Structure formats: C-alpha cells, structure tokens
Symmetry: C3
Subunit: 323 residues, 3 copies
C-alpha cells in the first residue's frame, strides 16, 4: 500500500525533477555551434647556433586551429639530383643482387648497383637527391620552445539565440595581454597559453615530447545556459595528447615529417635543403551547446510530465490491485 | 464537455499534423552527409607595382575548403642572421639593464645590450633575422582583390539513399561558367563567387576587412526531401564573418600571419624575405540531411500516433470524469 | 481473440527484442569519439627524368589527415615580372580593342595592347609573370606513384569509458610493418596502405585519376561494443571518391592547383618556377561510437519496456472489447 506512494514519489521526482529540471527540458537547445579559431605563436629559440622565429619553426604558417611547433630537426644541406649510396645500415649491400625490389623505400630509386658508402660499410646505390640523409647521432631539441606562447582567438556563436561570445572579452586591454596568466579554472579568458603549460596540462614531459614529436589537443567547450548571465557563459579548457598510440608503440613513437627548401644557382641547377622535422602539433577543438527558456518546450515538456506521472500511477495502481 | 472534443482536436492535430506530417515522421533520415569541396581562385592584382596572381596571394595553395586571399603585406626584404636593434618603439632602451626578460617577444633573442636604432631613438639589441620588421606607416591593400573569383566544386552524397548531387549540375557548360551570375536564391548552381560579393553577403566592407584581415564563412546546406524531385535538392548558401570577436575587440582587430621566402647566395649564406600577410580567410562549411519515405517508420510512426491520441483522450476523459 | 495474443507477441518482441536487445538499450553510448591521425608517404618516382621523393610530390607536408600526392605537372620554369602575350588560343586577338574586360582571367593584368605570340597566332598582352603557361600537349603522369605507400597512425579514444585503441596494435613489430598486407577485412591493423590499393578500393582507375586529379576518402569507423572483448574493437575501412561531381562533369573533371617555387638571383631580381599540380588528395575521415553496459539505462530501459508492453496490451484489449 505504501509502495504506491513510494512509486508516486519516484515518478514525480524522476519526471519532474531529473527529466524536467536537471535535464532542462524547459529549454530550447542549440547544438549547431558556429566556431572560428585563429592562432599566432611567439617566441625565439637557438638551434644549430641559429636563431629561429615563428617563420622558422611554425608550420603551416596561416594561423589555423592546427599548427606544428618544430622542436627538433635533421637537416640535409645542399642536396642535388644524382647518384649516391644509401646512408643507413638498413641498406647494407655486399652483392649487387641484394639491391632489389625487396628493399625498403629509400632516398631515391635503386640503380641495382652496389657502392661503398664508407671504407667500413657498403650499401645500395640510388638515383635521387644526394647525399642521402644520415641518422647516426641524435639531434638536440629547441629547449626555448618550452616558453613559446600560443595566442588563441576563438569566436563562437549560437545562431538560434543570436548569441556571440569569445575567449577575448570586450574589455580586454593591452596590459591584460601583456600580463594575464592563463588557467583553465582561474583565468579562462587569457588569450596567451604557454606552450610548456599546454604540454603539462596534457600530461606530457616537454623534453620527451619535443624529442619524439607528438600531437596535443586543446579542447574548448562552450556549454552555456543562456537563461543565466552572459558572464556565466565561459569557455572550458581541456588538454590531452591525441596520438595516444605513439606512447604505447615502439614502431612509431612520435610525430615527424619531411619537407624541403628549394634553391637554384645562377648556373640554374637545382639544389635543396632537406628537413626532417620533429614537433608538437596543436589541434584546437571547439565544441559547445546552448540552452534558453522557451514557452513551447515548457508546455510540451510539462504536459508530457503529467501524462507520464499519470500513466505511472495508473499502471502501479493496476499492478497493485491484481497482486 | 466540449473541452473533451477540443483536447481531441489538439491531440489529433499535434500528433498527426505537426509531429507526423510537418516533422516528416513517415521519413527515414540520413544525417551522415558525405561532402567534398575543391576551390580555385582566379584574379590578378597590383601590389608594390608588381602583378600578383593566385600563386602569389592564395595560401595554402592546394585548393581546400579553407584558404586565404592575401590583401595586405608588410614585406621585409633580405633578412640575414645577425645582430640588430629592435625597430618598434615598444622596445625603447636607454640602459642595458632595461633589456631583460620582462621585454615582450621580438624579432630575435635579446643580447642584453642596448643599441641606437636611429639618432632620435635607442632600442634593445637582438640576435636573429636582421633587420627587424618596421611597422611605422600603414601599407596599402590590393584593391583588385575585390574582383577575384572563387570556384567551388562541392560534391555531396547521402549514402543511405545512394544519392549524389553537386553545385555543378551535369548540364553545366563552359558558357555557363563564363557568364553565370551567382545568387543564393536566384542561381545557386553557379560555381563562381565574386570575392567582393562573398564579403558583402557576409555583411562586411571589403576595404576595412582587407585592411585588418578576417575570416569569412561560406556555409552550404543540403537539406533535401528525396521524396520530392531531384531538382528540388538544391544547395542553400549562407555567408558570415566567423571571427566575430575581432570587430568587438581593440587588442586584436583582424587576421594576419607571418611567413618567409628563403633564399641562398652562391656564397651559400642564407637570407630570407619576411612577409606579414593580412588577408581574408574563407571557410567552406557543408552541412545537410536527407529524408525519404520508408514503410517501416510509417508503420511505427502511425502506430505511435494512434496510441498517443488514444492515451490522450483516455487521460482527458478520466480527468474530466473526476472533476 | 487470438489477435490479442498475436499483438502481445509483437509488442513483447519489438519492445524487448529489437528495441531493448538489438538496439542495445541496456547500453550507455559514447558518441564523442576523440580521434587523431598522422600520415607519412613513402615512394620515389621518375618525372621529367628527375627522381621525386615525398618532399617533391606530397603536399602539404606536415602529415595531416588530408594530403595530396602529385601525379602530374605543368612546369613553367624561370618566370619573371614583365610583359608578354597570353599563350592559350582562348586569348586570340587581332585588334587591341578585343583586349578588354570581357576577357577571362589570365596570367596577369591586361595592358590593352595586342601582341604576336607566334607567327601564326596573335593574342592579348599581359603584365605579370612571364612567360605565360602553355597547355598545348598533355604531360605524363608519374606511374610509380601507384606503388607509393601511405602510413596511417590513427588513435581513437572514447573518454566516457576511458577507452583508447589504435590501428597500430601494441604488439606491432618492425617485421609486421615491413611485411603486413593491408586488407579491410583480412588485416585491418596493417598501418601501410598501397596508394594503388586505396585507389582501387575507391573504385577508380589509377591511370585516369592520376591524369585528371581527384579526391579519395579513407573512412575509418570505430564502432565498438565495449561489453565484448577489447580485441573485438577493430577499425572498419571504407574507401570512396569524394569529388563525385568531377566524373559526371565535363567543365571540371578532376582536381589540380597552382603553386610556385620562388628564387632570387645574386643580382637580386625575383624569378619563379610555376607549377600546375594534378594529384590525388586523400581525406582520412574517422568516425565511431562505443557502448558499454550500465545499470541505470538497464533499469530505465526495462521499466519503459514493461510500461510499453502494458500500455499496448491495455489498448489492444480495449479496442477488441469495443469492436
Ligand atoms: C615499409 S613501407 C612504409 N610506407 C610508409 N608510408 C611509412 N611511413 C612510415 N613508415 C615506417 O614506419 C616506422 C614508423 O614511422 P615513424 O613514426 O615516422 O618513425 P621514423 O621517423 O623513423 O620514420 P622514417 O625516418 O623512416 O621516415 C618507421 O620505421 C618508418 O620508417 C613507413 N613504411
Ligand atoms: C605578450 S605574449 C604573446 N604571445 C603570442 N603568441 C601573441 N600573438 C599575438 N599577440 C599579441 O596580441 C595582440 C593581438 O594580436 P594581432 O591580432 O595579431 O595584432 P598584431 O598584428 O599587431 O600582432 P603582431 O604584429 O605583434 O604579431 C597583438 O598586440 C599581438 O602582438 C601575442 N602576444
Ligand atoms: C570565368 S571566372 C573563374 N574563376 C575561378 N576562380 C575558376 N576556377 C576554375 N575556373 C574554370 O572553371 C573550369 C574548371 O576548372 P578546373 O577543373 O580547374 O579545370 P582547369 O585545370 O582547366 O582550370 P584552369 O587551368 O583554367 O585553371 C575551368 O575551365 C577553369 O578555367 C574558374 N573560372
Ligand atoms: C622561460 O623564461 C623564463 C623567464 O621568463 C626563464 O627563467 C626560463 O629559464 C625559461 N625557460 C626555458 C626552458 O628557457
Ligand atoms: C570584463 O567583462 C567581464 C564580463 O563578464 C567581467 O566578468 C570582468 O570582470 C570585466 N573586467 C573588467 C576589468 O572590468
Ligand atoms: C651547375 O654547376 C654544377 C657544379 O658547379 C655542374 O655540375 C652542373 O653541370 C652545372 N649546370 C649545368 C646545367 O651544367
Ligand atoms: C571590377 O571589374 C569591373 C569590370 O568587370 C570594373 O569595372 C571594376 O572597376 C573592378 N573593381 C575593382 C575594385 O577594381
Ligand atoms: C539543367 O538541369 C537542371 C536539373 O534540374 C535543370 O533544373 C535545369 O533547367 C537544366 N538546365 C538546362 C539549361 O537544361
Ligand atoms: C657571404 O657573403 C656575405 C656578404 O657578401 C658575408 O658576410 C658572409 O660571410 C659570406 N659567407 C661566408 C660563409 O663567408
Ligand atoms: C610496383 O612494384 C612492383 C614490385 O614490388 C613492380 O613489380 C611493379 O611493376 C610496380 N608497379 C609500377 C606501376 O611501377
Ligand atoms: C596482437 O594483439 C592482438 C590484440 O587482440 C591480437 O589479436 C593479435 O593476435 C596479437 N598478435 C600477436 C602476433 O601476438
Ligand atoms: C637582373 O638581371 C636581369 C637580367 O640579367 C636584368 O633584366 C635586371 O634588370 C637585373 N636587375 C636589376 C635590379 O637591374
Ligand atoms: Na628512419
Ligand atoms: Na605588431
Ligand atoms: Na586551363
């Protein structure tokens, strides 16, 4: 008998409490958030006893939500089209018959010939950009990169509610930019993020990450209850490492890529500087949903709540009557 | 008593009208739209008394759904690694003690020394790419850019219905491409969009936007009722400015980025031309959903409609009987 | 009378079978899959009797989920700023009055003058990068590209369940990478995909696609029932051509873009090599959802199932009683 009142309390609390209130059933929701992100990196570093600025270590440069900060390099200066022996011992050859299709991809095409790379070692010859890259001793990382700064201009708009807000508040001043200390909880509206800070929030050691290269995710969440104040609509920052496979795998431990700088002589012959770049890639991911009171969903939601509590009390009353 | 018939009419109209008909409950919906976009920009401009073509002002060049049209530049010719004073007055120095870590990021690293940039002004010395960039007088914009054209090839497919359509209709001819006048309502299938037109549809003044740089969004919506004709499935174009924070903020008003062109002398020393690029970034955003009649959702939906009207009439009859 | 039992069986089977079991209503679902992709292309080709490696034919180089493998080129060596006649016959001129605004976009700006490109043909003069590109005879494709390899490191994580898996299994070894043969069904965890294989899975002929250029989609789906074994969570590969409009359209049949290599003389004058690149663009699209048993959805789902079967039997009993 009392279980009838108990079931009534559970129905009323669930349908009118969690379902109607906690789940904001009274609210119209906009999930088609419109986001824009623009980035700018600042910092200088010493690498190969040369100073490196944003135009040196940032790529691509257009300042999108995805960019790489180069922290390590294998530089192959003055490559030229020609024939030369493969550098790595993986291409060791003693007989020209060993230089065949079974060989792994290399700096160029295989001539089928076999050549001496050094007095001690002989490898397969290739036609391509010469000389081949040599990966015998590890290259240093750009320590100063830990202090580089990332400037994130993130604009978001829920169009259903014609609501626009950004991580740059309208009262932001040059002094703020010069002195604000970003923190996900303490100061979400500071547009400057310290690269090292981003790496640590992601749970990574800058030394190792900068050695291997990696992909870090900067997630920006705009979950805003437009019923509450405009100043309650604030961005929630999360940080992680997206290439999680890399740490668990010995075959491929990080992130790197190769690109070249192309030059011509007055003579007119082409030569290039090859670059194997290790760096930290930053993906700025923006998500959000907004909700605002609307009478229509309040009517439909409350009507559904009353029909639900009624059907519940009816069925429990029947089940109690028969049993 | 009559309110029983009124409630019956509201239930029947809501569940069989808005819910079943207006909401196309009889329809199976595909929301996993598959989209592809390829872009090509055409136009020539005069800047620094030099002609600039797509390979000069478009970046990146691969013709993706996101690209920048450079409209303004600060060009720093023939930079070389070395030591030089900072150009901007923000780095004004009178004592070498002022050249410290508190200084903002600059062209290079700080030597701690203090040097005379000019007879009137003295600033901090830096090691890096020299000379530093000078932002004393504003640079002009590339007016002709207002007439550049954007070619958008957008292919979409709802795989559930094996439906494929594109903004390029199969009867498109070279004359069409040469003469069609794009309009979101009047001619949605003209693949050529005038940059200036795109800027205005976005509610922006090309002169100001091209001065500050900005991000414009070209949204393409494919909402198609595959029950209706194939020719009713047409793209709906919307235009906006995504970096809305920029206009409301004095600290950062637009969009720009820095990249370099790298050169070598026969002597072998590196020198580069630095470029601070202001431009309009175009993000082509494609969305869509499709619906087609399917008997299953018609059965389940109609059954749910009858159970709903029945439960409604039952509950209203009970509430009327007791009260 | 028997139709009452029939309706009871259909209600019980639908609500407790398809709705509760087949639809895994007992399961909590994570649809906010977190994905990261890194790519690396390997292979060498012969083009213009020059060897081409990843730094030559891959763009952009940063190894993102979207990259192009250049398979065809129109190379315009040593362009210089100046005046020259337009190359293509589309710009044929006999009178300087024909060189006007009605002309289509060209290599540069129009001087309004008319010049002889050859003894047989006269075209409009332009100021810009000279000479203009000549598209009279088709250029070959890089056949070897069919054998290039794409290395895909895809990391995925359902955070709700703190579940992380990747196409690189933790027991992956160098021998595996050297010898595994990718197949969507037979070996989903081989990280090396043969470009030609990808083209064929997409239903395309490499010769034609490489002639015209195109966009191929590599879709990776992680639909995992975390109730089952970890080793049951495997990636499902799908392949397609995203620029489907291209094959149905004569005006634009493929995908190409133009970029330049910029050079300076010791004299200091600029000259560039223009490149019209035809290639295959690969878009790696990752999707997924995960589900794991949770008691809460089991309680709510089973309660809803009993209320549903009860309401069904009640309404069918009433409809049978009255009729
Ligand atoms: C044997 S066929 C093939 N095709 C690829 N596209 C490809 N991309 C990467 N790999 C190989 O897969 C391994 C992991 O790649 P990785 O994380 O880039 O390490 P890594 O920097 O030593 O790769 P590389 O220096 O050899 O370019 C590595 O041994 C690399 O050589 C690839 N192998
Ligand atoms: C003080 S630490 C820091 N780190 C950044 N990554 C960064 N990126 C941009 N800023 C600064 O934030 C301001 C807004 O950036 P902006 O919209 O790019 O304007 P701007 O073109 O004058 O920026 P810059 O010329 O200084 O590169 C501006 O004063 C710029 O100097 C940045 N400041
Ligand atoms: C007449 S205004 C205009 N503006 C564009 N941005 C634009 N982009 C491409 N087109 C034209 O539209 C046609 C299809 O473009 P496409 O697939 O790139 O073929 P294509 O390689 O011969 O294009 P182009 O060599 O002329 O650059 C083609 O004739 C091309 O010239 C464009 N036309
Ligand atoms: C970062 O900069 C601070 C000064 O603001 C300096 O004390 C510190 O050593 C720097 N860190 C690195 C890794 O260079
Ligand atoms: C700037 O405006 C925001 C808007 O809510 C407010 O929270 C903040 O206190 C303001 N800062 C200053 C310095 O007025
Ligand atoms: C350019 O110079 C190099 C060495 O100085 C020489 O090998 C090459 O043949 C020259 N180019 C041409 C086209 O002769
Ligand atoms: C755009 O081109 C038209 C000719 O089609 C010309 O009349 C107009 O002045 C041009 N606009 C600009 C800003 O150059
Ligand atoms: C091209 O086909 C579309 C398909 O609906 C049609 O609307 C249009 O009128 C056709 N144009 C011509 C010139 O036939
Ligand atoms: C290259 O020339 C410049 C000036 O002509 C000179 O400063 C530099 O030392 C030269 N390079 C080398 C390696 O000497
Ligand atoms: C691809 O490589 C194989 C050797 O593994 C060779 O037999 C075949 O001819 C190559 N295909 C092309 C198109 O070069
Ligand atoms: C590697 O681990 C996976 C995990 O399920 C397993 O299926 C596979 O058989 C393992 N391979 C080897 C060689 O142990
Ligand atoms: C550079 O040389 C070319 C031809 O050798 C000449 O036309 C040009 O005027 C030179 N540059 C300058 C600034 O004189
Ligand atoms: Na290697
Ligand atoms: Na500045
Ligand atoms: Na053409």
């Amino acid at each position: 008998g009392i279980i009838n009142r108990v079931v009534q309390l559970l129905i009323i609390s669930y349908f009118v409490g969690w379902v109607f209130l906690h789940e904001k059933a009274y609210q119209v929701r906009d999930t088609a958030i419109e986001s824009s992100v623009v980035t700018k990196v600042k910092g200088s570093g010493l690498y190969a006893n040369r100073v490196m600025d944003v135009s040196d270590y940032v790529t691509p440069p257009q300042g999108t939500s995805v960019f790489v900060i180069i922290t390590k390099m294998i530089v192959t200066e003055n490559q030229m089209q020609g024939f030369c022996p493969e550098s790595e011992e993986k291409y060791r050859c003693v007989s020209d018959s060993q230089c065949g299709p079974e060989r792994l991809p290399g700096g160029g095409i295989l001539t089928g010939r076999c050549v001496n790379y050094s007095s001690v070692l002989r490898t397969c010859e290739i036609q391509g950009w010469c000389p081949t890259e040599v990966d015998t001793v590890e290259t240093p990382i750009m320590m100063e990169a830990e202090n580089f700064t990332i400037f994130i201009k993130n604009s978001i708009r829920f169009p259903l509610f014609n609501f626009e807000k950004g991580n740059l508040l309208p009262n932001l001043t040059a002094r703020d930019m010069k002195t604000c200390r970003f923190h996900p909880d303490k100061d979400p509206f500071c547009p400057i993020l310290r690269v090292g800070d981003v790496v640590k929030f992601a749970g990574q050691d800058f030394a190792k990450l900068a050695r291997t290269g990696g992909v870090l995710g900067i997630k920006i969440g705009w979950v805003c209850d437009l019923d509450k104040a405009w100043d309650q609509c604030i961005p929630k920052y999360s940080f992680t490492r997206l290439d999680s496979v890399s740490e668990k795998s010995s075959v491929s431990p990080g992130y790197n890529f190769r690109f070249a700088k192309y030059y011509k002589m007055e003579n007119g012959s082409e030569y290039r500087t090859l670059l194997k770049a290790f760096g930290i890639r930053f993906d700025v991911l923006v998500y959000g949903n907004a909700g605002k009171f609307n009478i229509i969903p309040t009517i439909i939601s409350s009507v559904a709540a009353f029909t639900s509590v009624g059907v519940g009390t009816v069925l429990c009353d029947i089940i109690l009557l028969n049993f």
